[PDB]
Ligand binder design. Structure first.
Ligand SMILES: O=P(O)(O)O[C@H]1[C@H](OP(=O)(O)O)[C@@H](OP(=O)(O)O)[C@H](OP(=O)(O)OP(=O)(O)O)[C@H](OP(=O)(O)OP(=O)(O)O)[C@@H]1OP(=O)(O)O
Lengths: 245, 215, 237, 805, 240, 227
């Protein structure tokens, strides 16, 4: 389009004349240059799926994990920039730790998401720092509150989601999660669906190799967030390969 | 600094404030127009007490003003902790103008866009003072602030005399606002405070209404 | 750099403070608060653009204390941050001072915090608007609104957002004509005002109403069946 | 010569006289070019010029002692270089190419320094002076001045080699940090002579620059340098034919420059769209496939790109709508409003309404109706605040109204009259002091919709006086002010002489046969003779409307103020100000009709044996002397009202100013403002110089500024009135003015002295008339004048910076 | 000429969604000499090529001790590698003092990445202009980690960083299918043949320019210098 | 000759697109400004020569020190003015003495050079630490970047490269200390072109037997008696 050189877009501490903070927008545009993480909550849990790109055949096949355990009942699927995403993994992890140490129980999702979206927001109004270039989904399950899936963008806004998608093919992933009855499915159907939606939105002629990472939390894991078994993962792989055809 | 002159540009865009030092007191009338009928005019106050004997009023930027209202009241009560005596008005203006000067020396901040009219009564003797955003303070017989303060300062220079009473000084402080009001003032859209020997108080709108009826 | 940070223009203006009000309009949403004889309502619209989003989490109505509520308009993360700061100042007033914070004192406190953003150059103004409602023990219903400039005022009615000026024109023609009051009319006035300037003939999944009354000062967020009970009563007249 | 140049070469200092001496040989070289050889001298001229550029060379070897100060201005060194080249031995071109090979490191944008201010001057002045030499040699007529010989004229290769040597510093200086101004002028003058060598590099650097988003310094560079190259780019030129095909691609891709964020690129984008739309008739000439021959393979591809002209004037216009929609006020202060418009944004509505009026006179009637509907829906349904955003929309509206007066006015004037009529009906809106702001915007819209061709507005005569019958007396100073400038623009549309079309193609441009071909006319410069200005001279019908509108809206309140000067009509200060505002806008609109103040001559000034006669210039209206002169009655009323205010209501600081303005325009104003004419004149030379086809010599210019220059000749004609008789009715104007010059309030004194100082340079021998009346107050013995009368009499006696003293 | 509005500080996002100071620090590691790291099932070998300021100077060190089980090799600014060594040595000492066990190598690498993200986001401070190649042995076997100036860390089968280390990665990806089943000497010779292919045609691996660091199961981290690389280089083949 | 600057040099903390900090680059190649100083490490000890450039004969030559004593076994020759080096010299002395206080042993020349180079992390001093420890005699050059390296002959200062190309040629491993002192004087006289006497050069040796020793005027002129 056209560039701007007046310099309203050089610090997050500055509005534009039409009222935008462009550094937050440019950080959010760093997220849409990254591969797609999807998250779907169901009747009994939240399922995460990341197309983790493998940009060298020399890595250890499990390097650069974009799925995080931030508490034993909450998990974190990241898009965007990894080093900022690991910083926020440490922040969310420390915030869960401090909540348990001060109040005596596990941090609620919707409270973890708010307390981490406030950190992400506090890095969006100063000239001494820049906004984070990662959007991320937090997904939990417990017995009292059900499945909980929030996503936090670089702006610092956290909304609840039945399905969610962050990354470069997030929109067609919103389409193919919108073709899905997630409010009635169980977690073991949502893993097949997450795998096939990740295999649909993956353009092999631009980025050509990836490793699908899945993580669930739910009734079937006793409200613990885990990577999930390789057997269930490779059945989801085979259903996604055959499903695509 | 250039920000001090640009901060005085935000004062002269503010609403008119007029303060007149009578023989037995000091008035401080201001312009308080509401932008629409939706605003509760009872809510926010421009004439504001600092002590039981010092009040003040401003022109310019209200949020900047409340920062020095809060800090004038703190400096006054930390004088009262030390001396158990109500602070002299001139001493308080030195303290407040020192605060208002601090935000011009330090970088990374701007000056206040507010100029204060500090009134007072101490030792049986009234005081009229103006603190500028530079941190400079001047003692006055009468002065104007805000929008067309120049025309107000020469309207006052014509109607000021030293053997003037407090009620007549309320009458000629309403007139100095009325020379620039633009559209028929009432008791709900100006705000007057007086010092006298009884202390500072902000006039009740029922008491402003009779002063307006006398004109 | 005279238009990048919060310092004065040569004609005495703060351009970043002016651009924070432009930032309020970025949200696309308009909020309206009106005040009655023994009640004060807040109505905002609840445009949910993504249909696989949990709509129970998208809300601009916030509980500050049990007796004080809040509608936010503007940049959403800024809004949640200013809500957390208002909740802190309310609880700390109750702790230090032994009684519940008044609505004017909370709104004055949040505006005093916002002035600091308008004066230090190292951080920006926080580009959103708070409207606080709550029942005063001596003055009745209070509607207070603080802007990113650090101003606050008390309002017979007010509006915040994209269609603020036309909502203000509507309510200004309204409150000089009648003294709008009663529990039902004041929700009527705040639903009609939002509807007239948005011109979209509400269904209750699309707005959200928050009330305080003198008879029960608890801040309530209206149920969708209750917004139906007002929209059906308004939509046949 | 041999004496003086041997003296020149034998010195090596920088004396202060050898810079006098190079000013002499530069003048000698230009006037005699097929003469003195300069061949033993050229290796010394060029090397002393390079020394004058005083470039830092070597390992930090410095020259505090060396003469840095003078002796080598490049204005004269350029003249001396360009007068030596040509002839059988180029030698001078070899040295010139070697010079720019020696400085090519210093023109790079990373290498800026104190040398660059003068190295930019070499680069902006040298191709200009070669253009002037080519014009001197080629396109200037035979005359008394000694013509240049055939042996020493610049040939084809001789000017191709100049372009080939100088262009790489010019392209290198395009991206300079100082601001690309003096490289754009070089690119203008180099494209008049060799456009095929100049335009393809600047658009090879422009299309990436206008694509990027990390190098924004390039967009301001590569658009300001396409302004100057534009008249060459849109013409072709018989050896660079591709030229224009680059216009509408580059015109469409520049549309995100219309931006609320940058002032700096939105200026140059407006100034780009305005210069690449006067240069093109944007009539949709794409329905020509019935024209199997008579076309060029360029012209075919250039007419089957013309269909994107709706997609330019509508995609441009959403860019201009969003800039308005985020150029609103957003009032941040509780205490006061802003109510004024800063310098930075009163330029982006001059640029906005300039390029949108430039576009819209250059579009066909097919394109215009779509643009009119898009104007009308946005101004009608998107209600605007009346300070910065509605000021922009209503000036965007009157561009469409100024183009085709009969169709655009049909949409706005019934709508705005109906919507004002529905909102003024309550009859308690007359004494309402706020005016709910839908009346404000439509009242502002109608106020500025009407400064248009007045003959095309006499249709909406009856139901437009009815909108003035009710709004002028409405007590709100946003709303009688927006209704008296409605009266202002209604009088001066009906009274004043002005052109109406400003199009690039004479007297036509909305013509039904599209079988002939408008896109072989991109340019067509000048044509002073077959020009065809559509003038608006006032007819008797509209002069009658102007006097009716003056006898319906000036005369009642003139009666009112005349009674207020008496002991009748105890009249409010907000009501005196209103009536003086109506009187001011009514004079200030209808000035051309009413003849100036006349009376008996003042007597005892100066014995005058030859004659002291005013100049009587016609200016085209023929004053009606059988009507009562309306300046005289207004002067009669405001002198008596000045006596009333300066004796009964001394403090009325707002009406009094308008007594000052009404004295200032009763005494001076005949239809034209002096300051507006000055501003227009300044604008004209900036537009003329940036589009100056210097090489060609018949005043070839875009028909737009060539019509604007005849309007400047008319304004210069109606504005210069010479030393007319001082005429005692003007003496009372300046006696009573002095009374305002020495008054209680300093602001009324300061505004009163500026019309006082302008009153004294207008009448011959009247500065001497008032010497002992300024001097009354500063007498030692005149008992008790005042502090302020004394201070005012000596401000009066000081003068100002550029007037009488 | 094409001057960039956005590559000024690290706290500026470009409108293309990028941070240019991080990207420009990413090629501070291609200003360093090549270094190959590779692991077997039992050992992890860091082979680096080091250069001398003159023939009389003594060949700047590139493999550095961090603990008895962790040894790293550096490419890029050796001033930032010194900050990173001091940090990593102190973290190894702190968890051998508190827990009386060696570090997991991945936890130290995570802790490095959390250290180096902080100057990628805060004003007036540059990213670390070094990339490390981190060999370690712990309970999970041997480990080869790459950390980059982008504060992104990589778990590797084999890796090469430094100038013209593409050719080593072309060697290593071709031959990584047999690294795990190597003994020590063949793993070192694979690392040397990867390092030997980051050379021009006239240059060869000598005892002065080659430095080899090995950690393993029953072997602490040891750096093999000048005389000590002679058993490892006098078993290779001539350059193909 | 002319001027060759870009947009990526002289930014104080800013990488170039080739990973380079050119503000630091030009501030290291501006510490060539110092006078020449040649250290040669031999097996019989290390020698340190530096040129002195006395202004006036009213000035004490023993008052501008261009070779200092770090400890009894370590000397150091700087290039540049002494006031830039003097915090590095004082740091080196304090570090040797703290190492002695904690450890009851002499600090190695490498560890002193490392402790100075930590404090150098620019600071704009090139130093030459020559000394004798348990690893024999050792010479260490430490450029202003903070990079230190053992080197067995090294010239720092104004003609560092022209003297270094001569040190590449006279030096061999079996060189005696007197041959090193004569060679360093020959190369100092070459890069100086002045007559060589005991008022424009300093010289100091650190031998394995004796301590750090500065040559006196009588001992110095015996060396230039046969140069
Ligand atoms: O009236 P203005 O604004 O002051 O400007 C006059 C100039 O001032 P003057 O009339 O003497 O007071 C005069 O220039 P100089 O005498 O100083 O050289 C004329 O030059 P001339 O015509 O003799 O010289 P040629 O034709 O250029 O060779 C005109 O300049 P061009 O446009 O180049 O000439 P064109 O009018 O186009 O023919 C120009 O007419 P415009 O009004 O259009 O600007």
């Amino acid at each position: 389009m056209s560039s701007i050189g007046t310099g309203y877009d050089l610090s997050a501490s500055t509005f534009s004349p039409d009222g935008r903070v462009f550094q937050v927008e440019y950080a959010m545009k760093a997220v849409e240059n990254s591969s797609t993480a999807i998250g779907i909550r169901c009747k009994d849990g939240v399922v995460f799926g990341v197309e983790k790109l493998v940009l060298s055949k020399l890595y250890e096949e499990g390097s650069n994990k974009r799925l995080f355990n931030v508490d034993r009942h909450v998990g974190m699927a990241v898009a965007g920039l990894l080093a900022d995403a690991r910083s926020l993994a440490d922040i969310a992890r420390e915030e869960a730790s401090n909540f348990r140490s001060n109040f005596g129980y596990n941090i609620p999702l919707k409270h973890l998401a708010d307390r981490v979206a406030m950190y992400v927001h506090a890095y969006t109004l100063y000239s001494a720092v820049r906004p984070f270039g990662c959007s991320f989904m937090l997904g939990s399950y417990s017995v009292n509150d059900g499945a909980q899936l929030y996503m936090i963008d670089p702006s610092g806004v956290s909304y609840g989601y039945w399905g969610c998608a962050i990354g470069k093919a997030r929109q067609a992933a919103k389409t193919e999660i919108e073709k899905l009855q997630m409010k009635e499915m169980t977690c073991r159907d949502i893993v097949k669906e997450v795998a096939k939606i990740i295999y649909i939105v993956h353009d092999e002629v631009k980025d050509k190799a990836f490793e699908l990472e899945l993580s669930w939390v739910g009734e079937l894991t006793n409200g613990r967030h885990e990577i999930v078994p390789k057997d269930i993962r490779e059945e989801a792989e085979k259903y996604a390969k055959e499903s695509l055809k | 600094l250039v920000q001090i002159e640009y901060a005085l540009a935000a004062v002269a865009g503010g609403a008119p404030s007029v303060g007149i030092k009578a023989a037995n007191g000091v008035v401080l009338a201001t312009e308080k127009k509401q932008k629409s009928i939706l605003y509760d005019e009872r809510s926010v106050h421009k004439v504001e007490p600092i002590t039981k004997h010092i009040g003040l009023v401003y022109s310019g930027m209200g949020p900047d003003y409340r920062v020095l209202v809060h800090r004038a009241r703190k400096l006054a009560q930390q004088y009262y902790l030390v001396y158990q005596e109500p602070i002299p008005t001139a001493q308080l203006v030195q303290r407040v103008a020192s605060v208002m000067q601090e935000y011009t020396q330090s970088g990374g901040v701007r000056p206040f866009g507010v100029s204060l009219l500090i009134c007072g009564w101490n030792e049986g003797r009234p005081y009229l003072f103006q603190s500028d955003p530079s941190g400079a303070y001047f003692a006055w017989k009468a002065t104007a602030m805000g929008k067309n303060y120049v025309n107000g300062k020469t309207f006052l220079e014509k109607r000021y005399n030293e053997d003037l009473e407090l009620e007549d000084a309320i009458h000629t402080a309403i007139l100095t606002l009325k020379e620039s009001f633009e559209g028929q003032m009432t008791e709900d859209n100006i705000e007057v405070g007086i010092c006298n020997e009884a202390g500072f108080r902000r006039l009740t709108p029922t008491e402003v209404k009779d002063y307006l009826a006398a004109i | 750099f005279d238009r990048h940070i919060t310092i004065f223009s040569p004609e005495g203006r703060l351009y970043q403070v002016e651009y924070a009000f432009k930032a309020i309009n970025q949200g696309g949403l308009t909020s309206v608060a009106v005040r009655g004889k023994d009640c004060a309502v807040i109505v905002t619209q609840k445009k949910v653009p993504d249909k696989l989003l949990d709509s129970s989490t998208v809300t601009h109505l916030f509980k500050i204390t049990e007796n004080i509520g809040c509608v936010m308009t503007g940049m959403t993360a800024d809004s949640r941050s200013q809500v957390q700061r208002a909740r802190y100042e309310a609880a700390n007033w109750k702790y230090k001072y032994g009684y519940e914070i008044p609505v004017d004192m909370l709104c004055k406190r949040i505006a005093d915090i916002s002035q600091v953003y308008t004066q230090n150059a190292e951080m920006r103004p926080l580009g959103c608007c708070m409207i606080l409602i709550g029942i005063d023990e001596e003055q009745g219903p209070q509607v207070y609104k603080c802007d990113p400039a650090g101003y606050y005022c008390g309002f017979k009615a007010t509006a915040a957002g994209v269609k603020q000026t036309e909502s203000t024109s509507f309510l200004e023609k309204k409150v000089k004509k009648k003294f709008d009051w009663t529990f039902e009319q004041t929700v009527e006035t705040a639903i009609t005002c939002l509807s007239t300037v948005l011109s979209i003939d509400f269904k209750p999944s699309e707005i959200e109403v928050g009330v305080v009354t003198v008879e029960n000062p608890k801040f309530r967020i209206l149920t969708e069946a209750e917004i139906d009970a007002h929209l059906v009563a308004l939509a046949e007249r | 010569f041999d004496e003086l140049i041997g003296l020149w070469v034998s010195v090596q200092n920088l004396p202060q006289w050898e810079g006098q001496l190079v000013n002499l040989f530069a003048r000698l070289a230009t006037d005699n070019i097929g003469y003195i050889d300069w061949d033993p001298y050229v290796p010394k001229i060029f090397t002393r010029i390079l020394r004058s550029l005083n470039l830092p060379v070597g390992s930090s070897q410095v020259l505090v002692p060396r003469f840095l100060t003078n002796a080598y201005d490049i204005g004269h060194a350029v003249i001396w270089i360009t007068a030596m080249m040509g002839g059988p031995s180029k030698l001078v071109q070899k040295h010139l190419a070697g010079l720019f090979n020696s400085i090519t490191s210093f023109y790079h944008p990373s290498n800026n320094g104190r040398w660059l201010n003068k190295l930019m001057k070499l680069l902006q002045r040298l191709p200009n002076s070669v253009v002037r030499r080519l014009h001197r040699e080629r396109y200037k007529k035979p005359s008394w001045l000694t013509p240049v010989p055939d042996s020493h004229k610049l040939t084809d290769q001789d000017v191709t080699d100049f372009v080939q040597c100088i262009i790489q510093p010019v392209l290198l200086a395009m991206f300079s940090k100082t601001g690309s101004l003096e490289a754009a002028q070089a690119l203008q003058n180099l494209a008049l002579m060799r456009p095929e060598l100049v335009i393809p590099p600047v658009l090879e650097r422009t299309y990436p620059a206008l694509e990027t988003l990390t190098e924004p310094h390039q967009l301001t560079a590569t658009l300001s340098c396409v302004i100057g190259v534009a008249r060459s780019l849109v013409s072709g030129g018989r050896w660079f034919p591709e030229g224009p095909t680059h216009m509408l691609p580059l015109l469409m891709r520049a549309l995100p420059g219309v931006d609320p964020n940058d002032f700096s690129k939105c200026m140059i984008t407006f100034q780009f769209i305005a210069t690449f739309s006067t240069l093109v008739p944007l009539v949709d000439c794409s329905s020509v496939l019935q024209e199997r021959n008579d076309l060029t393979e360029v012209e075919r591809e250039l007419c089957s790109a013309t269909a994107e002209f709706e997609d330019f004037v509508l995609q441009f216009m959403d860019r201009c709508f969003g800039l308005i929609e985020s150029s609103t006020l957003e009032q941040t202060r509780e205490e006061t409003e802003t109510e004024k418009m800063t310098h930075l944004e009163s330029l982006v509505e001059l640029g906005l309404s300039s390029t949108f009026s430039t576009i819209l006179t250059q579009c066909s009637k097919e394109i215009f109706m779509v643009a009119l509907q898009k104007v009308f829906n946005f101004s009608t349904s998107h209600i605007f605040e009346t300070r910065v955003a509605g000021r922009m929309v209503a000036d965007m509206c009157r561009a469409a109204v100024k183009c085709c007066p009969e169709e655009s006015l049909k949409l706005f004037v019934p709508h705005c009259c109906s919507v004002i009529t529905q909102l003024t009906m309550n009859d308690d809106v007359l004494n309402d002091e706020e005016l709910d702001k839908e009346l404000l915007w439509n009242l502002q819209l109608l106020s500025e919709i009407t400064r248009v061709d007045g003959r095309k507005l006499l249709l909406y005569r009856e139901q437009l006086v009815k909108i003035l019958q009710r709004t002028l007396h409405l007590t709100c100073k946003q709303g009688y002010t927006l209704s008296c400038n409605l009266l202002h623009h209604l009088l001066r549309s009906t009274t004043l002489i002005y052109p109406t079309e400003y199009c690039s193609v004479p007297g036509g441009f909305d013509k039904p046969p599209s079988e002939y071909f408008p896109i072989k006319d991109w340019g067509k410069p000048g044509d002073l003779w077959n020009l065809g200005i559509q003038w608006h001279v006032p007819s008797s019908e509209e002069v009658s409307f102007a006097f009716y509108l003056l006898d319906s809206f000036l005369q009642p309140e003139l009666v009112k103020l005349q009674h207020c000067g008496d002991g009748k009509l105890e009249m409010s200060r907000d009501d005196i100000l209103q009536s003086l505002t109506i009187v001011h806008n009514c004079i200030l609109g209808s000035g051309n009709l009413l003849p100036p103040l006349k009376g008996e001559p003042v007597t005892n000034l100066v014995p005058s044996m030859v004659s002291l006669e005013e100049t009587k210039l016609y200016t085209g209206l023929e004053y009606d002397l059988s009507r009562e002169n309306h300046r005289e009655v207004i002067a009669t009323v405001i002198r008596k009202l000045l006596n009333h205010i300066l004796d009964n209501s001394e403090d009325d600081t707002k009406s009094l100013f308008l007594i000052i303005k009404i004295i200032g325009d009763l005494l001076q104003f005949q239809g034209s403002h002096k300051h507006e004419f000055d501003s227009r004149w300044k604008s004209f030379n900036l537009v003329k110089k940036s589009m100056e086809n210097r090489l060609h010599g018949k005043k070839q210019h875009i028909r737009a500024l060539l019509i604007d220059r005849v309007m400047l000749q008319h304004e210069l004609r109606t504005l210069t009135v010479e030393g007319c008789e001082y005429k005692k009715i003007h003496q009372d104007m300046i006696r009573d003015l002095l009374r305002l010059s020495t008054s209680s309030y300093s602001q009324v004194r300061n505004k009163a002295q500026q019309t006082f100082f302008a009153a004294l340079g207008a009448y011959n021998f009247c500065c001497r008339d008032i010497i002992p009346l300024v001097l009354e107050f500063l007498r030692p013995d005149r008992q008790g004048v005042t502090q302020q009368q004394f201070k005012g009499a000596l401000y009066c006696l000081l003068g100002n910076h550029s007037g009488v003293c | 000429m094409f001057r960039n509005q956005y590559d000024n500080d690290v706290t500026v996002w470009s409108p293309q969604g990028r941070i240019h100071q991080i990207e420009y620090a990413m090629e501070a590691v291609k200003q360093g000499s090549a270094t190959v790291g590779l692991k077997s099932k039992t050992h992890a070998v860091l082979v680096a090529l080091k250069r001398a300021q003159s023939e009389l100077a003594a060949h700047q060190k590139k493999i550095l001790h961090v603990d008895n089980h962790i040894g790293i090799s550096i490419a890029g600014l050796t001033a930032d590698a010194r900050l990173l060594c001091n940090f990593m040595r102190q973290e190894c000492l702190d968890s051998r003092f508190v827990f009386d066990r060696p570090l997991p190598v991945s936890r130290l690498v995570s802790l490095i990445g959390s250290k180096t993200q902080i100057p990628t986001q805060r004003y007036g401070r540059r990213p670390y202009g070094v990339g490390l190649l981190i060999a370690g042995y712990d309970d999970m076997g041997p480990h080869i980690f790459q950390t980059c100036p982008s504060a992104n860390y990589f778990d590797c089968r084999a890796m090469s960083i430094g100038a013209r280390s593409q050719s080593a990665r072309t060697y290593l990806e071709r031959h990584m299918s047999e690294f795990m089943e190597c003994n020590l000497n063949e793993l070192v010779k694979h690392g040397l043949r990867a390092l030997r292919e980051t050379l021009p045609a006239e240059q060869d691996l000598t005892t002065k320019n080659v430095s080899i660091g090995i950690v393993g199961k029953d072997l602490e981290f040891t750096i093999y210098d000048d005389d000590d690389v002679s058993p490892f280089l006098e078993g290779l083949e001539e350059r193909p | 000759m002319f001027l060759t600057r870009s947009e990526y040099d002289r930014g104080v903390n800013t990488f170039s697109p080739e990973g380079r900090l050119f503000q630091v680059e030009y501030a290291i190649e501006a510490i060539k400004l110092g006078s020449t100083a040649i250290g040669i490490q031999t097996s019989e000890g290390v020698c340190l020569a530096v040129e002195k450039r006395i202004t006036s004969p009213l000035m004490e030559p023993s008052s501008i020190e261009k070779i200092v004593e770090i400890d009894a076994h370590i000397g150091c020759a700087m290039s540049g003015l002494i006031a830039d080096a003097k915090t590095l010299i004082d740091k080196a002395r304090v570090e040797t003495q703290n190492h002695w206080f904690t450890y009851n042993e002499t600090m190695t020349v490498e560890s002193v050079t490392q402790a100075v180079s930590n404090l150098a992390l620019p600071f704009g001093v090139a130093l030459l630490f020559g000394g004798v420890d348990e690893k024999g005699p050792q010479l260490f050059h430490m450029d202003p970047s903070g990079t230190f390296v053992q080197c067995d002959a090294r010239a720092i200062g104004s003609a560092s490269e022209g003297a270094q190309s001569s040190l590449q040629e006279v030096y061999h491993k079996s060189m005696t200390l007197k041959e090193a002192i004569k060679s360093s004087l020959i190369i100092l006289k070459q890069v100086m072109e002045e007559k060589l006497n005991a008022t424009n050069i300093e010289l100091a040796t650190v031998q394995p037997g004796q301590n750090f020793h500065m040559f006196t005027k009588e001992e110095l002129e015996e060396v230039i008696k046969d140069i």
